[PDB]
Amino acid sequence: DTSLPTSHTYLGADMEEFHGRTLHDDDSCQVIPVLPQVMMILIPGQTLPLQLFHPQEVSMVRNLIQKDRTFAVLAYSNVQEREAQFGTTAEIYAYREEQDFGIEIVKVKAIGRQRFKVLELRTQSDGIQQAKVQILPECVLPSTMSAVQLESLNKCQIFPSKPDQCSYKWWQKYQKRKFHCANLTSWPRWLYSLYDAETLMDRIKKQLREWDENLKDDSLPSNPIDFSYRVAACLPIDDVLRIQLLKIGSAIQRLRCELDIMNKCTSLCCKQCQETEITTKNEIFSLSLCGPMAAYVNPHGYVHETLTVYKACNLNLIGRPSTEHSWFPGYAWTVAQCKICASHIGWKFTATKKDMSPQKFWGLTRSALLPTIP
Amino acid sequence: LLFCPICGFTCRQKGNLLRHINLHTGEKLFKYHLY
Amino acid sequence: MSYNYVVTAQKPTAVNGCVTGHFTSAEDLNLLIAKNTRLEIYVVTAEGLRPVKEVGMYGKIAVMELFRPKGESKDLLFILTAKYNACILEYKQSGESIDIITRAHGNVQDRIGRPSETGIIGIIDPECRMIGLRLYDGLFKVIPLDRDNKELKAFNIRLEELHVIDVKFLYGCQAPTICFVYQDPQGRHVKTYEVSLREKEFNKGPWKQENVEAEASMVIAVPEPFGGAIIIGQESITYHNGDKYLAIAPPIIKQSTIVCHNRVDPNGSRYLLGDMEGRLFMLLLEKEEQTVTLKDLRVELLGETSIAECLTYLDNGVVFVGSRLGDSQLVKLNVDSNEQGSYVVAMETFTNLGPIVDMCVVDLERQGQGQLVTCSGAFKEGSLRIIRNLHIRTVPLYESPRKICYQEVSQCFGVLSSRIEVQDGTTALRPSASTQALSSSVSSSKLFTSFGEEVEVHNLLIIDQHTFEVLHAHQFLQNEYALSLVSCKLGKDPNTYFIVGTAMVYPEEAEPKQGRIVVFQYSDGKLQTVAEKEVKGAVYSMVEFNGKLLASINSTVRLYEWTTEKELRTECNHYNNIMALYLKTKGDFILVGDLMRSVLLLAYKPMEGNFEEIARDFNPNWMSAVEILDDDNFLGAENAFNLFVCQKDSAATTDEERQHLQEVGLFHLGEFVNVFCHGSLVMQNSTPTQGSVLFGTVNGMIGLVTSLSESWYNLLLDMQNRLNKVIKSVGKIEHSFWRSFHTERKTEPATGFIDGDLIESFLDISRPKMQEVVANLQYKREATADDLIKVVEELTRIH
């Protein structure tokens, strides 16, 4: 079942949810609070689970819930110095309170909504930080052939519908019909296909299906912007690449960059070692509907972006299979360390009953992985 | 079985507990995480 | 800021619209032709076409319709521009003076709205009660056609159908009725609505919705007594009128898509149809009396013409074929076919340079006056055009020419060409330049379907510069796409070579993985393959860089050197993470650009033997061409038919500023620029302008960009501002609005560009108008009409 991870059942039972989605006007200037403990780079449309214990941030969340349910997640370029040029607004869409261990705890789940630029960063006297936010817009470009088009051929630009057989031939027909007027320019049709939204989404869909057997077409957004953000949220890439993707404002350019990453970045090595290969892009399998990767929260509230892989090497096992707070139900986890540098890489999930498939796999933290081009 | 609060690393002694925790890359925001 | 000056050496020649009516007078039969920004009015005569007027519009004519509201003695012309300037114009003649009056005008744009994927549609009710416009999906704009609506006030009506293919106003309807074809997830359907001006809404149409062919694309409103409508798709032609329904599936039309039509008989008994491959058919509506009703439909293949953008039947079997891909035609329809079975006989040909996909400047006669050799047309209309100061010579090729370069030493042009063949082994559709060459060779390199599918065969043609015969034709490997072509010497080799970059293209591969750089030598009538290099990508562009070869392989820029063994040796590489589609050089500077307007300026370091990035400017937008005006200024063609200029400030005192190419000039050209090239068509050998860059566009326009001084630019900007207050535009479109850098939901004022056409128009205005323009103009001394006349004449002499 690929839908279980997205529900974050590990947090608890049904959580109070808010359907009041809110979006600020493009280019608008806002003032947004920043949660001090969050050190993750959030892509729009990406889910972020959180566990708050500190009284200050608990109070901040409580106040936010009553006003806009929105807070800023900063893409820290200099984490130690807390210098961030860009960030993402995150809207709280689920919230619950708990009194475990005789201590107040707040369990939350937010979703990234809009990228933005950082203008000012003011630290409040109560330990909370506020940011002057410039809501970035979505650079939307017209079809490449819109400018160079023939009035007679303006009709027949709407294809009947989308039914290799009946697909590759359909795509050949689509290229021939959509970029016919490419004969009026100095470039071929197949070159304009490399900048076409639909073709790029189709190629990315082929790759994702290669990563997921049960990936139905409807599961992905039909909008190029949302599709590009969804793809970016599930790529095993480092932080620098994630920031670079966030900077790109054009859906076409984002899709092209994502395709480049997926076609070139095939190895995943230890971040600290920089050379100890840990796995390859072929071993990635999607056990979550959101993608091969998903964010989870451990008991102490730390956020781990786990990527699931069939096989992993150069890993030493610490502890013994324990099912406590296991992110994937029915699987007992055991700590995995880099065989060379001993740095924690993830957890090996082993089956508890022999009827489960797969019988074993690994979940590697994204922050501990470096994508490498062989 | 001192449990590391980040990854779940387990050990019975103490020194290796720090030897693991300080090996983690980040600020670790302990005041915001430890129960 | 930059100071540039743009002129039109050749006005657009591609025909995008054509209508027939009674515009100049109630008795004269007039033909109106819309060529992008030009409107030509001819009087149809037994001897052909008599030009009566030619007008320039501050806009791209998208809709052009003739209508005669009650009380008018002759037709009025409705014109909509691509910027949504609508105008109702009248032809007023007084003695020998002709002027186009603007009966009404206004902008019909909407703040919000997505332009329809099927483009702008403009129709007029047969009773001239309203004008209907389809500009955005889900909306239908109605302009009441009352005489008090002098500002063309319009109102929107919501359309529940968002994917509308075609729409027409029906004849013989008590209330304004529209019949349109629209696509839903089920398929294509024909629907009808009644437009209510009082309620400003739609009411149930005269007949219920019907299902039509999945490829139904064309709607024809048949006039009385038939009424009803005809739906034309890729397989069948159907006629719907109330409960009456008729359908035919003539096989002849299945070979190609019918894209244009025109009504021959005023009662609708005959129609002209034109396909995408240049075939012309006649559709005949058999008539039977009961009132009168339609009996049968039949289609006859009249013959072959130039690929028709539009058709219009004038009289006496004469048809004007307006073509975008080739010369426009005036043909005669004969009652009886000739020996070949063709009823069509060509009477006149009208030159069309567009599309200009590439061009070069060469001084063939060697007098210091250059000539422009352009690759014009496409498919069977492809050809070479030789343009000199404006005499034009045509060399038909019958296949698409893509690139051209001139080899002075061998006195020949190297032309990359493409021809379409049908898999059946492949068979050529017709003889062409690549197949009729004197000598021929086929690529034979060790490196590296269905019946009916079309394939592209790429050739390099060596063409004599005097006779323009195809001296040689070399065919490239199967699936090989030749993208770039240069002619130059390399290293210490005294020989001159044709160097071709190619990519291996397969349908299953989104991006090419293999490619070739081939070095041929044309000597003593033979084209020999001197050298061959295999690369892992598409060689999009190539240039000669100080005796080396600078090539663009996918997203890499690679400098090769020509060794004494006559082989290409990699000198250095640079990785740009953008496909280097456009590659230009000057001195040691290299300009790299991709299709998304990303610009990157590198510099070659001879001592380090590698490239370093000098500057960068990334701004998502479609870019069709770039050029290097000088060491600091770079000219490019941007989406929405714009020109832009980027400037480099090396002495900026800041690393951030030194690495930014600020845009210092924008100008809405109205043309899709395909190629830039340094050169001039005027005799050379104090001048007010520096440099000269010709550019060729899709519509066949040739333009020239030159550089002015600050003083001259200021004077000419003042002159423009003064002229705009005196010259009256057709349709009352403001010049500043017309030239404002335009984009979908964005418009910036033009800057850094002097509209050469507006300045040149200063010589045509009358003396009182000249006095008004020059009044209180500071030359120190107050400028006088004579001084400005001299200045404008000097400017005109540059082309």
Ligand SMILES: O=C1CC[C@H](N2C(=O)c3ccc(N4CCOCC4)cc3C2=O)C(=O)N1
């Ligand atoms: O899949 C999984 C396994 C890994 C991950 N995780 C941790 O990082 C962690 C750290 C300390 C933990 N203890 C706290 C003290 O006493 C009991 C156990 C437990 C976990 C844990 O499940 C998780 O939450 N879910």
Ligand SMILES: [Zn+2]
């Ligand atoms: Zn390591």
Ligand SMILES: [Zn+2]
């Ligand atoms: Zn740990």
